[PDB]
């Protein structure tokens, strides 16, 4: 009797390759291909939460690197002046604070990370990582995220009080009603 498997007995078995951004590797190895991978993983579309949002185009694994919050690192004491300059030119300001003395300015050289909306029940979180003496802000998935789902994280604004309150439209059952 003939057997289709007789020639396969010694062959390498194949399966789906796991993306480096998703694997249990040191950060620099995961980060190396984040830019290319992110362009495949996510896109900017109209959102039911607010204006435009970032959405999943292709399943994202739990704990995988989604996208870097790209921009130029500046000192914390430059922000105010920069905000006034942009405001005076009709330019939308986008920044993400790294620590007390450093901030990422995504206004002029940012990417799609700028469009991530807030949610009181998020599916993403963020981390600061150092690669080659350079600080980067990286967004990770808290859970498996599926094609079509909106990516959100918790802005966790310091609780203002009055008035001063900005309403939240995240639509989560556990919504806090205000962004602050």
């Amino acid at each position: 009797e003939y057997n289709p498997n007789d020639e396969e007995e010694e062959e390498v078995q194949l399966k789906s390759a796991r993306r480096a951004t998703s694997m249990d590797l040191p950060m620099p190895m995961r980060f190396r291909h984040l830019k290319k991978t992110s362009k495949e993983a996510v896109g900017v579309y109209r959102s039911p939460i607010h204006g435009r949002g970032l959405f999943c185009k292709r399943n994202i694994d739990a704990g995988e690197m989604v996208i870097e919050y790209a921009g130029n690192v500046i000192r914390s004491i430059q922000t105010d002046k920069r905000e006034k300059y942009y405001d005076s030119k009709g330019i939308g300001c986008y920044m993400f604070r790294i620590d007390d003395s450093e901030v990422v300015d995504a206004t002029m050289h940012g990417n799609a990370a700028r469009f991530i909306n807030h949610s009181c029940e998020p599916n993403c979180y963020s981390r600061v990582i150092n690669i080659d003496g350079q600080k980067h802000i990286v967004i990770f998935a808290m859970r498996k995220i599926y094609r079509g789902e909106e990516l959100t994280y918790d802005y966790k604004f310091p609780i203002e009080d009055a008035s001063n309150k900005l309403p939240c439209n995240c639509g989560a059952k556990k919504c806090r009603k205000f962004l602050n």
């Binding site: 922000t79 993400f96 604070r97 963020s126 981390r127 994280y153 802005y155």
Partner: peptide, 8 residues
């Protein structure tokens, strides 16, 4: 509004 650091 500059996204905060306590975010991390």
């Amino acid at each position: 509004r500059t996204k905060q650091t306590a975010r991390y």
